[PDB]
Amino acid sequence: PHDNLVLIRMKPDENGRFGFNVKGGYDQKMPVIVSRVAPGTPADLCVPRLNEGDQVVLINGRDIAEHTHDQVVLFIKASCGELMLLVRPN
């Protein structure tokens, strides 16, 4: 992914949550995909909105192509004061 990308910025909630699920990485033979988006959460109310099926390319400006699922999760957990995501819509 490099042609039609979307840059998303979201501030975490009171509990330090964004309201979205991730699947894949380097340890999993599948890219990082946003599997689920919870309603009324930062991921659901941000502009542009983070949608289900979006392929994650960057997390806070870092390339996560060679990173495992656990590392990807911990990188998102280190942006809590906003989370930056570069995704490919699907």
């Binding site: 699920n21 991730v22 990485g25 340890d27 599997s35 919870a38 699922h69 999760v73 957990k77």
Partner: peptide
């Protein structure tokens, strides 16, 4: 297939 909420 691992899934994690954030």
């Amino acid at each position: 297939s691992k899934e994690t909420p954030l």
